[PDB]
């Protein structure tokens, strides 16, 4: 809901159970492989975001919440060093784990897309007022500048 | 009613008893034939959404739901490869499973039917503020571009 | 009241004993003749509404509703083929079932009367807001293009 | 909340292993060294506010708060004898204790940062509608007339 | 709070001891001196008001009041035969009687401070609309005509 | 309160120690002298109205209610034969009987005075909004015509 | 109060010890006279109203009701064959019967009167939308045209 | 032009041969036939309007004007004795006299057609806003009740 | 401009140098073929609109007028017996005859393309308030519905 | 000026003087190289827009006008087949071609960059009300999605 | 005005002799040093900016424009590499070349000073609406971060 | 008239003949003493502005213009070192040099008189909107804090 | 007019035969005898204003002016020392000097009579929007505090 209260990617107490991914780094499994080891909200090191190596347009990553809550906005950041963004995407959201939906507004009476941001000191948020009683959401980014990176930040009422 | 809560074809759990038409494939039956093996929201394969073969005018196609619900609002798509959109239908509602009804609002004073869409890629909704307690929703497009084909999608309050 | 629940007459369950008229089709008897076997909210056939042989100016129709409920709008529609429609007429209320009245409204300082459609295509709506408590109602048309036939549909709260 | 409620840094009585800093003054420890001897609301002495000598630009200041309370607002100060003022900082806020989050507001679709003031006189504040449910606050300024020197007060509900 | 209910100084039953001072008049003590003898609403006599010797620019003059009360608004007056006012000043307001602190509003962006009045028949009063939950209040005047003087009257809910 | 409920001075059941003064008439007394016998809300007679030998300008007149009130608004009169009014004067208000107290307004921002009247048929009113919670009421005529006289009638809540 | 309940006079239960005045008509009182013999609301016969001999400036008429009633609005009217109205009054009310009181408004900041008629067919009413918690009401006719005749008729919450 | 100038088919003394038709009523021609002998705004006599024998859906009337002028609005009227009335029709208007035109308006996003009249003492007129700057002006009636009878009059600037 | 003054096609005096199209319907030219011999406004016939064989996806139709003139506005209709309409195409306009320019409104922020109908009764016009000064317009049907065919109208200022 | 009155490019009677650039595609020369054989207004052809070899950040343009004109507005497209688009540039104009400067509004109070766009069929316009008198104008694209290609298009007034 | 007509620095054909200063590079002269050869509109090498060795509090530039002009507006800029901004300033403007006065609005009832800019990519702008008629232009920063350098930008009429 | 063309005292080339005071520095004569030497619009020297030995009440300082003007508004200022400002003054004006006229408004009701300011930064305007056709003007400073001392600047049309 | 451009009373170059009364002094004439040489605008000496010495109700003074103006608006002032001031009075003006008319304005429906004021210090002034063509100006004061005193001053257009 509109308030303060984003969820902690940078606490790292978190499994990497639910960080799902399908980018083996070292064969070393399926499930997950760069977790939030290298992708939290602004940790220095090696790693500023989430890199991707394959360029593959039907990109998605699960993000198991603790339960049922409901999510309105999503912040936007960069990367640093090497600046990259987005340019198009859509969010998900589902239930029984079994299917996936794309997110609509009821103001789009067009084939209108999500922007995102240009910058990694921009913030340019999306206040999603209507209210969306889901668990688990994704991103179906279609195009990006050099490689996906972007250090996303979920809400939760 | 306004919110986010569409139906869940993609899941494919419902039993293809409640969607019923009248297209033999393989002269199986005649209760259902197409079901949702080859027409749910967003599912790649073969068949991208329902195809008709017969140029039928007075097309209808049963959505038996759960149980008797609030519906508000209708999201409305395309067809991959060959695009195919509507142009004329109307909605209808009953109860008693013995009857058929049109969909008429109040400020229409004039011969006014629904659009829809022309594009796959747009979402042209239809924001209905007039609850409608009705429970079985059938469509009567009265034309189309080549073939009826889209990717319907009832909301449920 | 300001809703989408109209009547039931494409059920036909209702016995003839409620659609009481005039004009013996075949000497039968006197209550109904036409009844609801020809004359319903769509419904394809040889009649596809009440067909009139007198021109019988001051015409009336009995209709006898389950209980007292606050009526408000109505539908209006025309016929099939032969194009046919009214031009003047005023709708009437009882409860004793001893009298007959006029119905008139509040912003209706002259001797104003309803319109009603002159298409099959259209739907001129005539939305009542000021509610009526009664239960049988009847429409005394004044005019015609050639002969009374009208699919109407009351509306219940 | 929008109240006259601030904190109480001048009455001292709070034990100094709530401000935590990194500046040893005469190598006696690391927790502490500055605390509220010589940076209070409005103390005469020598160091009117807390001075820095490295020139860190991620500089940090814990501010253990006596329980999580609703912050909006803070003042703004200078400093006597020798002018001394930022330029750009920015909000931070933590419940776990085991990460650090930037304060990003609603009303900011750019990369827009807090300005503070320019003299010690000027009283300009921020006063932060939206409620911030946290304890914990810090502040990272990004740059300096010559010295960093402010006389903080927090505001709590 | 907006309401007529103010002190009671002219009745003079209240000890010498809440209103505590700095001017031995006769070397007699340090606690008070002129106390309210000389300084009431509207009090014939010799001294019509409060004066003072030493040109003190720190000046104060503790107020304790029976509880602690909502503060809201307060008075402006002159002194008669010299003419004799303030220019500039600054509310004070504590709790733990252990520091001072500065009233500062909300739509002041500046370092504005407050005015008072020029003029002995003159009622130029300052409506704090800000609740202010404290007890004890002071004044800092910084500047002035001759000497300070001027008939204070506090405003409690 | 702004209601039509004055006091009772035409009735004259109320003694004359609640109308103090100190202007005695034949050395009778120094409590009162011309009380309620003379000055009335319309009293036929010799006396017209309350009149004042010597030109008094800190004049008063206690007014003993029967207990506290929320007073707001006063009539305004003149007198017959000899046209006389005032021109300045200042209500009072006290609680302990032990002080003295001026009436000031809150959109009162100089040294404005209230008016009065001018005419004995005039009916110039102060509908005084703001509640006062008193009960002893003075008037402090600075000003007149040639001498005081004026049927005042106080309105209570 | 703003209603359609007016008094009883047409009724003439009412005793004619209610209706004081003091004009014998035959020298047989003092008490009553003319009471509701020949002057009430439209009473057909000699006497169409009440009538004055004596050229009485301070006129009075008593008027005892029920009980104590909120008393807003009176209704203007004339005389027949020979046309008389007033010009100038004034209401009164009391309570304890032991004074005299004159009825003034917040909205009149000068010496205005209220006017009345000036035609026996015209009903210029004066809504009195201040609530008069009384009783007796008297009225004070300062002129008229020839007699002061007019049919009143209080208005009672 | 908004203006009360209409033309004058009452007068007569304009020739038959700009009233063209195509009903010989006793084979005399071909250019006209009925003109404006029993065709006039208000001719007491036999034929109170034009009719019409064969139902000609195509009807067309010219009406030569003197010269090109601004056409803006047009009356409408019924016929007496036997009532007869239009629903449907198209306004016409051409220069060159080779070709035919429909008249179509700005604020007319779908097929709407104009209505008319239903009553020979009703006068529903179109005020037509829009200048058309042309000459002759025909009318295409695409229904009526019996036979077409209606006394135009157009309105020229 | 605003105004009804369209094009003369019905006149047919136009000579077919002018409709330059590229369908040889009988091998005789490359010209024109079709011409205005049965694509005119309304003209009974065999061809009620213009055909089209191929299906040729960038369409166009030369329409050279008398001179340049600020065109503003397009009638919009359909096809008799077979229904055909469009669903996307773009205005084009040019002055040197040796270049292509698309047409863009000012308030289109994004891929909108215009509609045009969808039924041969329906008028849905494109008010372009824009003033456009060219001469030559040519449309780029990028649909349809089985082959091109409408009967365009510009319209000249 | 807000008009539609585009440049030429598409014509190509243009010489390739004026378009001067920096990109020797075979060492013919220095002046220009692409000019606008392959970057013009929608040309089908091999190269569909203007491309870039060295990735050069500080890139311009040479455009050199008729004459000195009030240019207003300026399109946006992007490249076919491969898809490229920019994401941040200033525009800048000059007189004396002896300088270099940057275009900047009133209502931009920050370090605000004009956008572009990101879609070959988007044309997100930016309306520039400011008048600007100049003749020519560069571009300085500061990024890109892979290579610099958009088929600009001035607008003069 | 309210225009895009800047001055011409960057073509640095004007003279050094307006731009006079007191800041001897190699003790050549004493009118000028710096002059335009490293403080232009964006100008790449050494200098960047106007630099300042000794810290001097009453600053002043000579700037000799060609005729008396209306100047309105003056942009903000900052200086690479090493970031350097001011805080505080006041314009100048005088006629005669004989006296030197200051800059005041007619919206400034206080104390209050122009800002600037704070970052070398922020374009912060001071719309001076008062047409102000004058010529020479001074500018006396009363304080900076560490050397005055800013690339300031007259604007005239 | 509301613009920034001020007179010319920080000049000096006008005479001191204009400038007439009454304080012989050193008895040198009548006619003028301080004049233009010590007191203009910001002067580094000994004397900062005009000082004042003997407290006259009714001091005054003509100002001869050159000739009649509008004159509107006046700046404030105040005295560096020794801090002084007025409290109460009065403009005049006149003509014949015969007389002495008090500055009146019209939205002045009251004994209002003109504030000024009270501090040297300060720049408290009074924008005199009500034309004034006039030359010469003075001053009647009622009152100060220790001397007369204030660069005075009227504005002229 | 609504301007600044009083009379000129205090010059004194008017001879005293415009100033007509009938107060002699020392039985020197009847024309004049006070003139303005102890009643003018603000002239200190013996007689502050213009006494009276007979308590004449009909009190006139003739003003003959230079010629006819449009004269709106008149100063109020008092008289020092001994306080003195009207209460009610009325503006007359004539044109052929044989007639007296008073002054009534168009927005009083009533007894309404002009103030004045009541303080030497206080400026209530009377601004007359109604044009008023004449010359001769006298005042009717019907009363006073003790004796008629008013430094008059008119407003000429």
């Given at each position: 809901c509109p308030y303060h209260k984003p969820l902690g990617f940078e606490s790292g107490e978190v499994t990497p159970d639910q960080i799902t991914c399908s980018n083996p780094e070292q064969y070393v499994g399926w499930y997950s492989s760069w977790t939030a080891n290298k992708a939290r909200l602004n940790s220095q090191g090696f790693g500023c975001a989430w890199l991707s190596k394959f360029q593959d347009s039907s990109q998605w990553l699960q993000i198991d919440l603790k339960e049922i809550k409901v999510i309105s906005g999503i912040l936007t950041q960069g990367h640093c060093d090497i600046d990259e963004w987005m340019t198009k995407y859509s969010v998900q959201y589902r239930t029984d784990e079994r299917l996936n939906w794309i997110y609509y507004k009821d103001q789009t009476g067009n084939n209108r897309v999500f922007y995102g941001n240009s910058d990694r000191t921009s913030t340019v948020q999306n206040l999603l007022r209507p209210p969306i009683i889901s668990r688990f959401i994704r991103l179906i980014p279609?195009?990006?500048?050099?490689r996906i990176a972007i250090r996303m930040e979920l809400l939760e009422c």
């Open positions: 279609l195009g990006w500048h050099v």
